[PDB]
Amino acid sequence: NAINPRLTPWTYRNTSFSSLPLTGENPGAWALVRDNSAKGITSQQTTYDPTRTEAALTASTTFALRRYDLAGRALYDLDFSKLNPQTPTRDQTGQITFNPFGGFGLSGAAPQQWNEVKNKVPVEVAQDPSNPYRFAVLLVPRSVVYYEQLQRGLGLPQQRTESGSTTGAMFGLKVKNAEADTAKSNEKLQGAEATSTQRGGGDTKVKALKIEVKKKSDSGQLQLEKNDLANAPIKRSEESGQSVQLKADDFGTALSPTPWRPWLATEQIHKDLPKWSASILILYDAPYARNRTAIDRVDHLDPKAMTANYPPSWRTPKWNHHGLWDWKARDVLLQTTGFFNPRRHPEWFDGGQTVADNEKTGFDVDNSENTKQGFQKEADSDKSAPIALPFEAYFANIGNLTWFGQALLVFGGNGHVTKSAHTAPLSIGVFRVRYNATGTSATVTGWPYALLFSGMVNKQTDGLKDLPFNNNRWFEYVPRMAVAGAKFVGRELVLAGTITMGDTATVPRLLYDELESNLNLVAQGQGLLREDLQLFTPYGWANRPDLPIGAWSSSSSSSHNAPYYFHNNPDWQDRPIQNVVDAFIKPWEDKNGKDDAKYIYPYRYSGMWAWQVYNWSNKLTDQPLSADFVNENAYQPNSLFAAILNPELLAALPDKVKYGKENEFAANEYERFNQKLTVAPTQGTNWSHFSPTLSRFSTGFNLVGSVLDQVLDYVPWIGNGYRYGNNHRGVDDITAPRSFLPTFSNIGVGLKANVQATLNLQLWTGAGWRNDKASSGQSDENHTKFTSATGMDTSAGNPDSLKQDNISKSGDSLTTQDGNAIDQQEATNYTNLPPNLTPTADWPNALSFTNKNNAQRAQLFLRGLLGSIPVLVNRSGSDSNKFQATDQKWSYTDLHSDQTKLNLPAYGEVNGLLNPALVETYFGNTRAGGSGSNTTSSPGIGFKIPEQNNDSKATLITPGLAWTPQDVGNLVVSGTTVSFQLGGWLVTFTDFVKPRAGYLGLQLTGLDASDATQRALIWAPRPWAAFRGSWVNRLGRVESVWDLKGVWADQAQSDSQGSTTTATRNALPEHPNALAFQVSVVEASAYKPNSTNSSPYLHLVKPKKVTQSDKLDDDLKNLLDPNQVRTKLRQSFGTDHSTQPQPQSLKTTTPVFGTSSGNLSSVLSLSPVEKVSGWLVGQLPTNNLAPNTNTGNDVVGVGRLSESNAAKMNDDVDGIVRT
């Protein structure tokens, strides 16, 4: 019985592996086969014990391999549970005894510990490049193949409010402003140093805030005689008696709500390796021999082999290289502490959510004496939770075998094997199995990606510069990947997929008494809102996010402690002229690293998103390991990625990584006050040998950031097929002095700025300009006057009652003025400010006024390919709350006379885009209100500026698509290009191996939402379960396969027909893109103008405190479940012409891309940004779905599937046999 017919093909979800073609000396193929009719493991959910589950799965399932020939016939099967193999014999030279007629010499014994590994199932086969008869098969436990049937979800913290107690917070969020403790009122830092109410003034003197940390030479030693960094005059509030605090029992107690925990710890897997681990076995195969089957050995991929090479700083991930001051600063603000806190990242802790709080850090943080807090503890009852590799993360790291010499590499998979709705298990590193020359012994090791990627610089890429990829010597950046594959394009090892960057969304910190007005950012900081994008709520930020608590309150019992700690306002910043830097910085800047005292200068620092990112993220520089601030890590993969690796070093690295003392957090608080960002590696360590592994990397196009924003506007939304640029007719539109404003570009929007205002050019302002008017009143100026931008008419222009200053030119006397421009001339502030600080601000000549930045452009590119950019809405679109078509205007003729007709919120939405433009792309009200057909079929959702006495109670929502950033296909090669499937888009890195300068660098092909079957695939509740792999044809075109039968099975059963649990129970629905968003409350008086400036966006938009009445409505709280939005949108798409047969599988193929496709040299020979935008609009072509007419086609490489290049099938497919 060679061919078991009860078995049928299948595909392993984690790697898209279905089969392996073979050619040359051993032609044919290998394919996975199983009993596809079994149940697996079997709303009244119950607990499954692991042992009994694995027992029943062994007793009720069957897995094998199937061998084919060059003609496509099945030769035999290999059921490891029923096989009885024999280890093969060798000669004196250790070569496997083989002859093309007799087969292999069988010694008459089984492999070692074979009778305990035989029940594990094969999921991956890779052929040896040095021996076409030697294969490496990967085995996993049976319970891992059916883990998706257990459905163990992540929980929310239990709440006492629902809001739809008080404060209006939803989904369990704890938010409560902090108050000062009158008991510790002495612990405020005094501005001491010297050598004017608007500075340290102790009267009218310029004073810097002095921080001093000193030790006793008397008798964790030195006794820390004084620690200014332990001061805490501001403390967390008390609420119903007991203080508010982030506790791990918020999720329930381990045992109606129960916290999420890993199925098996790292320890249990290490202790039952034969049952619970994953194994590699070597296989010898000759299909035309007498003795054809011989199993050489079996090797285990022990998780501890990886966790033993983790950096030492990963043992206590609740700490960082900022010590105690940052711990208390983040704890008071209701945030998580450390770099990898378990409350944000529970998939890598054996405790799950039973440790998801801020306590037990491995250091003393609540001692009675301020001089004993911050000392690393050796007591073991107070040990922390270390970053580990439990069940789900461990099996997320298993896949993608690759040979090179004697080295067998395991790069990981995308994580769909153990992924849940609101979890994100990922690959943390690489496993290696290295064999000796004879193949008679093997060693197993693993290294984290953090270590292998530790030598990245800026000149190693060709796209965006300054991405948050840097790291430091503590390895606080933990790059995790969703791997597509590792392939050899000639001699180059290419690695590709998506990756987590460092966290930039919560870099800015709010003021301590502004939390209850900025609930969204507080949720992002508590780990409750699993959202990596930057949100636009800049009013309540502090001016800079790196100050200890001692600098927060006041010395005069006033408001916030300006000039040190006040409301962020880039209009109130100083200017970096010589006599100002000499007055405010130079008396002190030469004493910081001196006598153990650092100083905060009375210098006004302020800036928008780009300024915060450029100063407190981990952006890339030209020096490696030079990151001074790693804020946190991302929840999900938020960037496209591709890397080239030196394969010779990967097989030559050490087996065990030796870290030094330069890789640990300091033991006492005096030791880290005298720190250095760089320390040379110590003798007897090799952790610096892993750096040269990366030679080049890519994140997509080869474009400069501002040029990427026209490509992004030319890319359609995969939801309906309308481009994000809204057909905006480039620079020739009416929007300057069927078509709408664009989402990502400024070219043609607003006024034509030729600026010299602050520290020529021919750029634009965009939407939300605040130009002052000129003399007559009709002519417009190129700037905003400081006298207009700062006005007290609490006031959003001057909430902290700042005043002007000036410095008389000798370096001397300060202390007041209106700033006469004669002898005092040099005023501390600016005079002409840029005429924009909205989310669309982009000034190449003023960093403090820019909002768009590369770290956000990469995320917007990825989430725009996934079709899941959150939008801000305050109209539910339902009866009596519809967003009418006349509610929005775009013609600059009307906008110049009134700017609130654009409905730009300028508070609460995503940074970097035009929110009305995204509303127009998603829901299409402007293109709906231009015809009688479909009677405004738009669902009527959107945002409209509030009127006389209405407040805006808005929330962020997702359009409803279910593509995640872990939907990564397998990596295929075709010529000198690499390509893989990413959600619904087939990407192709065309200019990464051999960069052809003057080309875009990428090609995109997506699913066409104007075709019925592809549209059903796009809007499927689980569209990545239908992916069956990609492979290259004979002509050089990449083709993908989809199995649509589950899509039809789900379309046949409606579950969310009338679901209202979102608004009634405040639980997160089981949708992959459900996010615990909050409400943003803005009063109508915020959009009124002030007096030479009539712009509603002159100041920042001040929000309103959130109370138990400021909560959402029910009809709007309903849209927090993406299935309701999905229903409304597909109902707008309403039509019923089902195919019959409703094909069971569909096959897509890339079109033919010419030698002139994606070329920029034809237009790069006006600024290059405007040139590329104009070329795109020249190459650019009333309905709910944009028909794919193929005008947006092979001249750029950005195009969708034609009907002819997407072949449907009649019968479904689980596995694909390729010979």
Author numbering: 60 to 101, 106 to 227, 231 to 261, 272 to 277, 280 to 297, 301 to 336, 349 to 830, 848 to 869, ...
The study reports:
P1, together with the P40/P90 polypeptides, forms a transmembrane complex called the “Nap”. In the present work, we report the structures of M. pneumoniae proteins P1 and P40/P90 and of complexes of P40/P90 bound to sialylated oligosaccharides.
The structure of the ectodomain from P1 was also studied by single-particle analysis using cryo-EM. The structure of P1 consists of a large N-terminal domain, with Asn60 as the first residue visible in the X-ray and the cryo-EM maps, and a smaller C-terminal domain (residues Gly1395–Asp1521). The cryo-EM and X-ray maps of P1 are well defined for most of the N-terminal domain with the residues clearly identifiable, in general, in both maps. However, from residue Pro1388 to the C-end, a region that includes the hinge between domains and the whole C-terminal domain, the density in the cryo-EM map becomes weak, indicating that there are hinge-like movements between domains. In the crown there are 13 disordered loops, spanning 117 residues, which could not be built. In the cryo-EM map of P1, the weak density of the C-terminal domain indicates flexibility with respect to the N-terminal domain proving that P1 can experience significant conformational changes consistent with the observations that antibodies that bind to the C-terminal domain can interfere with the attachment and gliding of mycoplasma cells.
